[PDB]
C-alpha cells in the first residue's frame, strides 16, 4: 500500500538520548567511516575468496604434478640403470 522510498532530508540536530549537538560530529564521522570500512571489507572478502581459491588450485595441480613427475622419474631411472647393468 505504501512505499519505503522516503529518505532523511533534515539534520540530526536534536534528540534527548544518545547523539547530541556536542557529539553529533563523532556520530557523523563514525558512520561515514564504518560504511567505508565495511565497503572495503566486502572487497577484501571478494579478493580473498579469489586468492584463496587460486592458491588452493595451483597448489593442488602442483601436488599432482609433483607426484606424477616423481613417479615417471623413478620409473625411467630404474629402467635405464637396470638395462645398462644387464647389458
Amino acid at each position: 500500500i505504501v512505499y519505503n522510498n522516503q529518505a532523511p532530508d533534515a539534520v540530526n540536530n536534536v534528540g534527548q538520548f544518545g547523539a547530541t549537538e556536542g557529539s553529533i560530529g563523532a556520530y557523523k564521522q563514525a558512520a561515514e567511516y564504518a560504511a567505508d570500512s565495511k565497503y572495503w571489507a566486502l572487497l577484501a572478502e571478494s579478493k580473498f575468496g579469489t586468492i584463496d581459491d587460486l592458491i588452493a588450485e595451483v597448489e593442488r595441480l602442483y601436488q599432482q604434478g609433483v607426484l606424477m613427475k616423481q613417479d615417471i622419474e623413478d620409473l625411467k631411472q630404474d629402467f635405464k640403470d637396470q638395462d645398462a647393468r644387464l647389458m
Binding site: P8, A10, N13, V14
Partner: peptide
C-alpha cells in the same frame, strides 16, 4: 524516537 530539529 527523537524527531529531527528543522534545519531548512
Amino acid at each position: 524516537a527523537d524527531p529531527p530539529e528543522f534545519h531548512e
